[PDB]
């Protein structure tokens with residue numbers, strides 16, 4: 001099966017739906033649910049969240065599901081088993097606090113050469129990949145062979161400036177384009193998989209070849225009265241979780 005991997009950049013709103021593969025799974029990340037339309041449908045194979053806001057995103061995801069705004073088979077925390085990158089207790093107890101979820105590193109680490117490539121450049125040169133790229137590695141580890149990229153623009157497809165998210169991550173007021181491209185090329189080259197770019201106005205199309213024009217239709221379903229901010233747990237919830245925070 002093929003996979004569409006979506007970051008949340010402007011390009012997400014500029015998909016050339018003519019080039020959509022026949023049959024595919026969808027990977028989403030972080031604040032994908034801020035999208036004002038279902039640019040890639042309601043059904044996710046996997047949603048990926050950063051360790052630092054995992055508690056709050058998992059809580060928000062449960063409401064998205066409850067409220068029939070999205071579905072997802074897998075729930076991934078994009079960790080790396082590095083003390084300077086994420087809380088060691090959170091990781092240690094993860095499956096007991098989030099039993100239907102997965103540590104992304106369980107899959108990421110199956111790519112030995114890429115794990116090594118990433119670890120070296122991060123710890124040595126402070127080269128971090130974005131989640132778009134992390135999702136790619138995990139996809140390859142699950143045996144996907146064709147990856148179609150959207151929403152990756154090297155710095156959203158929506159107003160991210162929402163009260164709760166601003167409270168949790170005040171930086172919504174590390175990375176580079178090159179670091180991401182070099183990682184993608186490395187993955188393509190080393191693991192013999194195919195990258196495609198679904199967004200021809202994206203700066204990404206300079207680097208990855210355009211997915212092929214089939215004559216695909218896609219219905220972009222509208223959203224109303226939808227969850228467009230992350231939800232915050234109660235202070236008693238944080239109390240209980242606190243060893244892991």
Ligand SMILES: CC(=O)N[C@@H]1[C@@H](O)[C@@H](F)[C@@](OP(=O)(O)OC[C@H]2O[C@@H](n3ccc(N)nc3=O)[C@H](O)[C@@H]2O)(C(=O)O)O[C@H]1[C@H](O)[C@H](O)CO
Pocket residue numbers: 006007008009010029030031050053129130131132133151152153154155156169171172175
């Ligand atoms: C403030 C802060 O912490 N920003 C980071 C950001 O530097 C980046 F690390 C990332 O990406 P995030 O912004 O959510 O966007 C999701 C992914 O979509 C692609 N994208 C999006 C917008 C854009 N203009 N150009 C892009 O390329 C990138 O592949 C990105 O990783 C991430 O984990 O990769 O996550 C956010 C937050 O940690 C997260 O949103 C909190 O839940």
